[PDB]
Design a protein around this ligand. Sequence first.
Ligand code: BP4
Ligand code: NAG
Length: 340
Amino acid sequence: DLRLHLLLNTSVTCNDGSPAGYYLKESRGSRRWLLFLEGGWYCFNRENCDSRYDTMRRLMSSRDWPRTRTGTGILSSQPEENPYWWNANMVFIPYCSSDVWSGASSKSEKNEYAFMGALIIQEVVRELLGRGLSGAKVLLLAGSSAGGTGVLLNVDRVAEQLEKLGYPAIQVRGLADSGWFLDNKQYRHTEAIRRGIRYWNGVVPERCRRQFQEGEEWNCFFGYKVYPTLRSPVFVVQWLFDEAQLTVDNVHVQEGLRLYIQNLGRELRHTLKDVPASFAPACLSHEIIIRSHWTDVQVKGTSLPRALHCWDRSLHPLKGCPVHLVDSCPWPHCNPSCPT
Ligand SMILES: O=C(O)Cc1ccc(-c2ccccc2)cc1
Ligand SMILES: *[C@@H]1O[C@H](CO)[C@@H](O)[C@H](O)[C@H]1NC(C)=O
């Protein structure tokens, strides 16, 4: 069990003005820290955010949060469930800003909701330094879905925050799960993100912002465009046929759809060709790293916890311990280890 702490700085809030927070489980014999960003879509205007407030309120407010949460998958402390980092300090950061972790705007006379995802991450790091993070050797910022995109948007800012605070020895790294999307043609007929950024006062990494410039920051929400600009090491986990990618493409088999789906897998494989640390199975699924059975899937005979351990060794090519694992077969579930 991870225990809830609401932020001491009560000006850093969820959408409705209630305090943000984090769930923590310490491991006093470890210098590794895992900070995980929850996912869950987003909202981009008043009417669409009001709808989410009615039936997805735990993603907009801390008022009903439980005092504890069970750590699962990579957040599990049992070696059998988590061969990778079972002895690490574990942090689960709930997603209650509906802004893909990009916002920096308070609730005010002119704003019905607060969008503070980027400031939530910064404040969690700040308060954790007084609970042990000051002694860390590695801080892994991880996340699934919208939290996976959040890793790409925020990993370099966490690294810069710690350098300016006087902690140059903590190695900051990223793990982005199910957050690597394509701005492709739909099967049946980017605007929502463009409007979202203005609604949220969204912020993107600095080098990417300077490339695309004013009005075009939406580009930095797409993995294959923002990743080459990042300086921190980032491991990318991405199903080739992601269910949320297919949803935004209006896919739910004859030749037209077969060719569409095969081309989608090929395009995703191409964007990952020069990503040295990556895990990309040919499955129709969504999210993996906090699922209890996340140890089950394999690419070319190597599991995800093993690939992550090999990544750890590479940051000290390795014989029999690979870090770049991308399927080549062209149809969902051509890999036998895909989730049932
Ligand atoms: O959160 C989910 O369960 C699915 C999901 C993941 C990422 C994004 C996303 C938003 C903006 C830019 C890129 C990705 C949207 C939905
Ligand atoms: C609380 O957070 C806000 C927003 O990031 C910041 O401006 C303020 O300085 C913080 N307060 C303290 C005491 O650090």
